[PDB]
Amino acid sequence: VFNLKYTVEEELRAGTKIANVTADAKVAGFAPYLRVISNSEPRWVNLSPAGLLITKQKIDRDAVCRQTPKCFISLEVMSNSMEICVIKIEIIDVNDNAPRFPTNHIDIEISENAAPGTRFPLEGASDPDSGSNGIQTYTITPNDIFGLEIKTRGDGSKIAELVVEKTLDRETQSRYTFELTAEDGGDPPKSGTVQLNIKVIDSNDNNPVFDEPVYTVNVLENSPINTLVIDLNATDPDEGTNGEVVYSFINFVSNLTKQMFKIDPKTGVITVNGVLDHEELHIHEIDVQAKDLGPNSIPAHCKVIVNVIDINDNAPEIKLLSENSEMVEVSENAPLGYVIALVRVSDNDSGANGKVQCRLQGNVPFRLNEFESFSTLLVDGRLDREQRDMYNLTILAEDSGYPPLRSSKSFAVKVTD
Amino acid sequence: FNLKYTVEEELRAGTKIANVTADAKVAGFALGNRQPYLRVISNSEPRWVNLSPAGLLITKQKIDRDAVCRQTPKCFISLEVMSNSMEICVIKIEIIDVNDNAPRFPTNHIDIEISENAAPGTRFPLEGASDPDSGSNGIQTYTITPNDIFGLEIKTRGDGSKIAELVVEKTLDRETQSRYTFELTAEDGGDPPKSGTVQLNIKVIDSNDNNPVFDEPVYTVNVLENSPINTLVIDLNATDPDEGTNGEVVYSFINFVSNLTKQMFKIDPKTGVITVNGVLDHEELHIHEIDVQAKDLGPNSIPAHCKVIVNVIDINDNAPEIKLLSENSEMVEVSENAPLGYVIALVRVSDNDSGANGKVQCRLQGNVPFRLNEFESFSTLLVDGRLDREQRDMYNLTILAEDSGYPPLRSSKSFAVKVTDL
Ligand SMILES: [Ca+2]
Ligand SMILES: [Ca+2]
Ligand SMILES: [Ca+2]
Ligand SMILES: [Ca+2]
Ligand SMILES: [Ca+2]
Ligand SMILES: [Ca+2]
Ligand SMILES: [Ca+2]
Ligand SMILES: [Ca+2]
Ligand SMILES: [Ca+2]
Ligand SMILES: [Ca+2]
Ligand SMILES: [Ca+2]
Ligand SMILES: [Ca+2]
Ligand SMILES: [Ca+2]
Ligand SMILES: [Ca+2]
Ligand SMILES: [Ca+2]
Ligand SMILES: [Ca+2]
Ligand SMILES: [Ca+2]
Ligand SMILES: [Ca+2]
Ligand code: NA
Ligand code: NA
C-alpha cells in the first residue's frame, strides 16, 4: 500500500503521455490489470487499462492555483483485486502568463507643496504564475523628482508605493507623466507596463505683488466724474480663484477719499467719483489692498498719492475797507497822496493762477497804488469841488491765469473841506 | 510801517501782547493829540484779538492754534492800522504752538487679523494717531511692546508726518501660538513728550498646514470566522492639529481593495471604526489587507494611508464528511468466500476546517464482522469474520466520524452490503 510521484508541465496539449504505470508497478510493487476508483479533476487526467497515464487537455495551472508553490493532483488505483497505491502528479509552472495591469493607465492627484517624503500606495498587477515566475519588481521611468519604494509582503507579493523625493511646484511643472513597468522572474522575464499620469494641484502659495509700493500720479481739479486716475496691477501666478486678485480701499482714508474716488475691484482702476478741489485739499493718499480669492490669503498693499492740480476756477475778489463799503469821502483841500482807503486784492487759486493785478478805470483825479498785502488808494491832482461834488469810481481787477477772470467793485466818492 | 509780535496759544484773560503806542514812538510815528491814536481798519480774526483806544493790544480768548492751523509751521494774525492821519502800519502776530494736544488713536482698540503661513517680511499698514499740534509737538514715532516675533517700520513721508507699518519679523504658527496682544503707542516731540496709546490684536488664522499622522503604518488584529455583523475589527486613529474643518478627518478604503473586502467590512467615516459587514469565512479566505486612507476636510489637502491585516480564525463550523469510494453510492458487493483481508472499498475522511478542528477520527458501528483501517488521506474497508451467505446474505453497516474540535462535530454514512459466491 505505497506511493508514486510524477512531474508534468502545464499548458501542454491533450493526450501528452506522462507515464506507463504498468511497467512502474513492477519496478517496486505488485504484478483490466488496473481498475480506477478515485481521481481528482478527471477533466485533466484519464488513465488507460493498459497502465498508460495520459493527459486530457491544456492545463491552466495558473487558474486553478495561482501564486502558490507545489500544486499537485493525485489518484488511487487498485490491482487485479490486489493491494493498492497512490500516484501523485505535481504540475510544474511555466512563465506563460506575464504581468498585467488592470486599467491600461491610472490618473492620480497631488497637492503641490506636499512634503519631500510623502507617499502614495497604488498597487496593481497580476502575474498568476507562482514563485520565481511571479511578480518581483515594479519600476518608474527614472527621474530626479519622483522615486519608488517596493515594500515586500510577508507572503512574497511585492507591493509598491510612490514616494515624492524632491520639493514640488505647480507654477513650474503643472503635470508629469511616467511609464510604470512591472517585471517577472523567469529566465526570459516578461512584463507589461502602464502609463502614470500625475497632476500637480494648485496650492494658493503666492500672494498678490504690486509693481512698486507707492504710486505718485497728477490729476486736475474740478475733473469730470469717471475720469481716470490709475490702473493698478497686482500679480498672482496661482490658478483661477487662488490667483484672481481683487482690489479695495481699506481705511477710513479721509471720508473724502471714499466719495472722491471709486475703485473697480476686478481690475484695479482707480476712477474719479466726485468734485476734486485744490482749494478743499491739494494732495490725496489712498491705501489700496489687493488679495486673492483663495484660502490663506495674504493681502498685499500700496499707497497712491494723487497730487491735485490747480486750475483757474476762482475769480478775483475786491473788498473795500471802510465804514460804508459802498461809498467814502475826502477834502477839497486834500493834499498829495491822502490815503482815502485800503483794498484787498484777493485770490484763492495757486500762485500763477491767483496773482491779481488791478488798474483804475480811465483818466481820473484818483490814482491807485500797490503794496504787498493790500492796495493804497492815493489821490493824483486835486478837485476844485467848486463845480463837482462826487463821481462814482469802479475798480477793475483780473487774475493772471488762463482763461483769466475778472471782477469789479463800484463805489462812490464825494468831497468836503 | 511794519511791526512783528508773538503770543502763545491757549492764554486766557486777555493777556497783554504789546504796547504798540510805545513801539510806534520808539520807531517814530504820529504824535496825534487826538485820542484814538491808532485807528483799526483790518484784522484777520478780531474774535481773538481786540486793540485798545490807548494803543494797548490785549487778547480776548484762549486761542486754539491747533484748530485753525493744525500740523502747519506758521499761523499768523495780521492787522492794519492807519496813523492819526498820515501813514499806515502792518502788525503781525505769529501764534506760538504749545503741546496742549497729545496723540490720540480713533478707538481704544485695533483688531487686525493675520494668516498663519504669512512669511517673514510680510507687512500690514495701520492708521496711526491724531496730533493736531504743529512741528515737533506733532507725532514723531510709534512703538509696539517689544518682542521677538513682530516689529514695526515707521516710514516718514514728505508732508513731515510719520506713518507706521506692522511688519512680521519671524515665522508664524497657529498650533503653537494662536493669539498675540500688543500695545501700539504714539509719541510727541514735546518738552514733556506727550503720548497716547491703543491695543493691537493679531489673530493668527488657521492654514491647513498639517496632514494626519497614523499611530503606526501597519495594524494587524484578528477576528473569528462566521462572526456577526457590526462586531468591530479595529478602531483607528489619525491626528490633525489644525482648526475645525481643516482639522476634521474622515476615513476610508481606496483601491479596488478586493471586491470581497468591501463586501465583508464597513468603516465609519468619522471615527475610523472598521466594523464587520458579512459572513466572514476562513475556508473562503484566511487573511485580508484593508488599505485605509484618512484626509482632512479642507484646502490643498494631503491624505494619509495605513494597512490593516485581519487574520481570520478557524472555528469548528464545518462538519466532517464520509464519502464511500465505490461506483454504487449506497450498496457494495463481495463474495462469501473472502480471504480475511479483502479490501472491498475505500472511504474519504475529510474536513475543510484547518489544523485541529478538521482532523477526524472514525469508527464502525458495534460488533465487528468487518473492520476499517485508516491510512494517510483515506481509509481501507478490510474484512474480519468471513461469514456465510446462507444465514445472512446482507448486512446494513454504518460508519461514524467525529472531528477533534469543540463543539465537536460528527456525521455518519450507513450502507448495505450483500454477498455472492466465488
Ligand atoms: Ca496557464
Ligand atoms: Ca504558468
Ligand atoms: Ca509570468
Ligand atoms: Ca508653488
Ligand atoms: Ca494667490
Ligand atoms: Ca500655486
Ligand atoms: Ca476751487
Ligand atoms: Ca483752482
Ligand atoms: Ca483765480
Ligand atoms: Ca490748542
Ligand atoms: Ca497746541
Ligand atoms: Ca502733541
Ligand atoms: Ca502650523
Ligand atoms: Ca489638516
Ligand atoms: Ca494650522
Ligand atoms: Ca465556513
Ligand atoms: Ca472553520
Ligand atoms: Ca469540522
Ligand atoms: Na488691471
Ligand atoms: Na478614532
Author numbering:
A (entry chain A): 1 to 31, 37 to 422
B (entry chain B): 2 to 423
Relevant lines from the article:
Protocadherin-19 (PCDH19) is a member of the non-clustered δ2-protocadherin subfamily that is located on the X-chromosome. Mutations in PCDH19 cause an X-linked, female-limited form of infant-onset epilepsy (PCDH19 female epilepsy, PCDH19-FE; OMIM 300088) that is associated with intellectual disability, as well as compulsive or aggressive behavior and autistic features. However, PCDH19 along with the rest of the non-classical cadherins lack these critical tryptophan residues and must mediate adhesion by an alternative mechanism. Here we present crystals structures of the highly homologous zebrafish Protocadherin-19 (Pcdh19) encompassing repeats EC1-4 and EC3-4.
One of the Pcdh19 EC3-4 molecules was used to solve the Pcdh19 EC1-4 structure (3.59 Å), which contains two molecules in the asymmetric unit, each starting from Val one to Asp 422 (RMSD of 1.4 Å). The EC1 repeat has a disulfide bond at the E-F loop, typical of clustered protocadherins, as well as one of two α-helices (at the B-C loop) also found in structures of clustered protocadherins. The three linker regions of Pcdh19 (EC1-2, EC2-3, EC3-4) have canonical cadherin calcium-binding sites. There are 51 PCDH19-FE missense mutations (out of 70) that can be mapped to 43 locations in the Pcdh19 EC1-4 structure. Pcdh19 EC1-4 crystals were grown from the putative dimer SEC peak elution, and two plausible adhesive interfaces are observed in our Pcdh19 EC1-4 structure. The first one, which we will refer to as Pcdh19-I1, arises from contacts between the two Pcdh19 EC1-4 molecules in the asymmetric unit, and involves a fully-overlapped antiparallel dimer in which EC1 from one molecule interacts with EC4 from the other (EC1:EC4), EC2 with EC3 (EC2:EC3), EC3 with EC2 (EC3:EC2), and EC4 with EC1 (EC4:EC1). Analysis of the Pcdh19-I1 antiparallel interface with the Protein Interfaces, Surfaces and Assemblies (PISA) server and with the NOXclass classifier revealed a large interface (~1650 Å2), that is unlikely to be a crystal packing artifact (89.21% biological, 81% obligate). The Pcdh19-I1 interface involves extended and mostly symmetric, in-register contacts between repeats EC2:EC3 that account for ~58% of the interfacial area, as well as smaller, separate EC1:EC4 contacts (~350 Å2 × 2) that are slightly off-register. Taken together, our crystallographic structural analyses and binding assays including PCDH19-FE mutations strongly support a model in which fully overlapped EC1-4 domains (Pcdh19-I1 interface) form the functional adhesive unit of Pcdh19. The antiparallel Pcdh19-I1 dimer interface validated above reveals a homophilic 'forearm handshake' binding mechanism for PCDH19, involving overlap of 4 ECs from each protomer wrapping around each other.
